[PDB]
XYZ file of C-alpha atoms in Angstrom:
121
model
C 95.050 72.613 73.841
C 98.145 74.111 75.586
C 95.795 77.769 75.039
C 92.719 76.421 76.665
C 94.796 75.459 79.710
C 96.097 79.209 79.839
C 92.504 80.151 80.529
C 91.967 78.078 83.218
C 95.112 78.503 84.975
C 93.652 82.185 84.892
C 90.063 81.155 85.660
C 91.205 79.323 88.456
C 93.251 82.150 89.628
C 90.797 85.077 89.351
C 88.250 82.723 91.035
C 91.154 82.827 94.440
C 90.962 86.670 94.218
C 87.312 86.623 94.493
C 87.319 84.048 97.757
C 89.342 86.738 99.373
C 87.102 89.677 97.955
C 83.999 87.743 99.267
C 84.916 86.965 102.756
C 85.978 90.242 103.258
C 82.648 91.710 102.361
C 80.448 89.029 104.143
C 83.216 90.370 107.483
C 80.987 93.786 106.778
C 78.082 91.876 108.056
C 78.847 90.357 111.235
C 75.103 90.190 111.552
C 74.325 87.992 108.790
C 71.406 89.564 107.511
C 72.902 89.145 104.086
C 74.190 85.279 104.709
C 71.464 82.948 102.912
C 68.466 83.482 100.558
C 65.287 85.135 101.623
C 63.320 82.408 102.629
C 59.652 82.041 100.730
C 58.250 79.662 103.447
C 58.672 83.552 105.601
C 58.300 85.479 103.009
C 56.267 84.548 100.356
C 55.556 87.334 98.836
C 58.884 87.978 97.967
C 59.111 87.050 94.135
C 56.255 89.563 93.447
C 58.457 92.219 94.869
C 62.656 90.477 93.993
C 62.738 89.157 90.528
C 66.199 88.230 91.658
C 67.349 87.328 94.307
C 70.846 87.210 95.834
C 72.761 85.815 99.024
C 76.206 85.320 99.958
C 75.829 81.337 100.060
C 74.515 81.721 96.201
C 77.640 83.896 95.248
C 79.612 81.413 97.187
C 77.942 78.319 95.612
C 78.930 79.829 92.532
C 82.179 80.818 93.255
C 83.178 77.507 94.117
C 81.760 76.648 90.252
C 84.229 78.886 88.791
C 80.828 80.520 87.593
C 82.473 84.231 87.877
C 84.125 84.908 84.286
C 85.048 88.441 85.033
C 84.849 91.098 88.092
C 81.891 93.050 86.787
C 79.858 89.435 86.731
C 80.761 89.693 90.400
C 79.665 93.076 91.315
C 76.240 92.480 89.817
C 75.271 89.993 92.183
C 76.979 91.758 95.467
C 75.005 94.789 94.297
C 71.749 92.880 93.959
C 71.649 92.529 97.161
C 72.472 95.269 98.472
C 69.979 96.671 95.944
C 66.918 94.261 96.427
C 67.072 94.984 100.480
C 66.647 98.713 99.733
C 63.793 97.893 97.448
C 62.090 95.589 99.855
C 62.845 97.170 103.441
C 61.838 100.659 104.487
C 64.564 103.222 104.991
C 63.979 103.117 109.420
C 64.296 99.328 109.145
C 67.776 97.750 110.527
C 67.551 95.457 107.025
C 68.302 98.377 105.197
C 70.473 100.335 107.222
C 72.709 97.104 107.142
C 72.689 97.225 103.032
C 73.612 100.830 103.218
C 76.765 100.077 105.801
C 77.257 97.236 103.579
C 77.619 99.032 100.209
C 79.979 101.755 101.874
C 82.286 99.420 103.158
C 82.265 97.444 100.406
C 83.101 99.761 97.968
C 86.624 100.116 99.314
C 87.502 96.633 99.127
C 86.156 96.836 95.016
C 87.913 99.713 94.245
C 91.116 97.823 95.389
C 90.597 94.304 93.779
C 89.611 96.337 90.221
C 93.198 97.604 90.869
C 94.708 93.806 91.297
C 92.520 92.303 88.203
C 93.595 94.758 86.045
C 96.856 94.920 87.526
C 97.182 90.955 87.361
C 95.749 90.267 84.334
């Protein structure tokens, strides 16, 4: 259908937005502390403490698989891991100062692409 086209010329459209969005959050951590999963093989304990985990290269791999249907889909997983380092790591760790720095400078670059969603359709 002509209508089910419509929804993927959008799909595909939001999904550019949030390529932008992304790589201007993963900028906020030069370090890349944030960049791939938590490995198991280091820490294996992980799963008893994360019952989900989060990376940019999993938000990207998705990305790329149009898997974001909305912007709030989007912000769950950004905040996950923000939120699962501040769970795992103690406050005087660098992990978790870089989640905090993270979240801050994040937060401007959301409030502005809520604007151009809703704005854009």
């Amino acid at each position: 259908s002509m209508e089910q086209v419509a929804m993927e010329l959008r799909l595909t459209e939001l999904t550019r937005l949030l390529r932008s969005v992304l790589d201007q959050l993963q900028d906020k951590d030069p370090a890349r502390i944030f960049a791939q999963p938590v490995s198991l093989k280091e820490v294996p304990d992980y799963l008893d403490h994360i019952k989900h985990p989060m990376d940019f290269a999993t938000m990207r791999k998705r990305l790329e698989a149009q898997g974001y249907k909305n912007l709030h889909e989007f912000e769950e997983d950004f905040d996950l891991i923000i939120d699962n380092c501040m769970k795992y790591n103690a406050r005087d760790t660098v992990f978790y100062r870089a989640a905090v720095r993270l979240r801050d400078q994040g937060g401007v670059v959301l409030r502005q692409a809520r604007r151009e969603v809703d704005s854009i359709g």
